[PDB]
UniProtKB/Swiss-Prot annotation, chain B:
GO biological processes: negative regulation of DNA-templated transcription; phosphorelay signal transduction system; positive regulation of DNA-templated transcription; regulation of DNA-templated transcription
Start and end residues of each Response regulatory domain: 4-117
GO molecular function, one term: phosphorelay response regulator activity
Location of 4-aspartylphosphate modifications: 53
Primary gene name: arcA
Keywords: Activator, Cytoplasm, DNA-binding, Phosphoprotein, Repressor, Transcription, Transcription regulation, Two-component regulatory system
Lineage: Bacteria, Pseudomonadati, Pseudomonadota, Gammaproteobacteria, Enterobacterales
Superkingdom assignment: Bacteria
Portion of the full sequence shown: 2 to 122 of 238
Protein's name according to its UniProt entry: Aerobic respiration control protein ArcA
Length: 122, 121
C-alpha cells in the first residue's frame, strides 16, 4: 500500500548511486545523506521507513549516529558497512540495528532483508 | 510476558547448546526435532520465536518454514550449517526474519533474537 522511503547514510558517491538504483529497482523512494547532519535533517523533514547506515563517515561514525537515532525513534535500521569484524557487528546489533550487512554484499540479500524488515515495521 | 522460543534442531549437542544459550537469556525453551513435533508445540503453546535448522529428519526446514509462513507471521530465524548463498537467499525469501550460519557467535544470536522479539512481541 504505502510507498517505502529509504534513507541511505553513505559517504561514497559510487556506493550511494549503486544503493539508490538497487532500491529504486524495488519501487522505493530513496533519500540520501552523506553524514549525520544531513541524516538528521532528512529524518526531521520526510517520512522514512528504513535507514541504511554506513559506519565510516565524515563527522560522527555510523554506530554513534545509530545510538542517537535509537534514543528518538524505533525506525527500521540496517548497517551496510565495510567494517567486517565481529566487534562492530555485535555493537551495531547491540545498539539496536535490526540487521548488519557487510560490503561487499549480495544485492538480493540486501533487498530481501529490507523487504522482510519493512513488512514487519510498516 | 517471558519469551517462548521453539528450537527445531535434530543434532542434540547443538540443540542442548541452544537451549542453554537461550535459558541464560531467561527465556522458556521448547524443543522439536521435526515438523510433526513443531506443529504440536505450536498448537499447544504460545511461541514467540522459532529457530529453524534446515537438515532435519523428514521435511527440511526451508519447507517447514514455508508451510509455517502460510499459517503464521511468528518471528523466525534459520540457524543452520547450510552456509551457502542459495539457501541463505531462499530462507530469507521464504520469509525468515534472519538467517544465521553455524558455527555461530552466541552473542550475535541472542542479540538478534532480542531485537526481533522487541519488534514482534
Ligand atoms: F510494500 Be512492502 F515493502 F511492504 F512489501
Ligand atoms: F564506510 Be562504511 F562503514 F563502509
Ligand atoms: F542441520 Be542444520 F541445517 F544445521
Ligand atoms: F514478515 Be511477515 F510479516 F511474516
Ligand atoms: Mg563510509
Ligand atoms: Mg540438522
Amino acid at each position: 500500500m504505502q510507498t517505502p522511503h529509504i534513507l541511505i547514510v553513505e559517504d561514497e558517491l559510487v556506493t550511494r548511486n549503486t544503493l539508490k538504483s538497487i532500491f529504486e529497482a524495488e519501487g522505493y523512494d530513496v533519500f540520501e545523506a552523506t553524514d549525520g547532519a544531513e541524516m538528521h535533517q532528512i529524518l526531521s523533514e520526510y517520512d522514512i521507513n528504513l535507514v541504511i547506515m554506513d559506519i565510516n563517515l565524515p563527522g560522527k561514525n555510523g554506530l554513534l549516529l545509530a545510538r542517537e537515532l535509537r534514543e528518538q525513534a524505533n525506525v527500521a535500521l540496517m548497517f551496510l558497512t565495510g567494517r567486517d569484524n565481529e566487534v562492530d557487528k555485535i555493537l551495531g546489533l547491540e545498539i539496536g540495528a535490526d540487521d548488519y550487512i557487510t560490503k561487499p554484499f549480495n544485492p538480493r540479500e540486501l533487498t530481501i532483508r529490507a523487504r522482510n524488515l519493512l513488512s514487519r515495521t510498516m
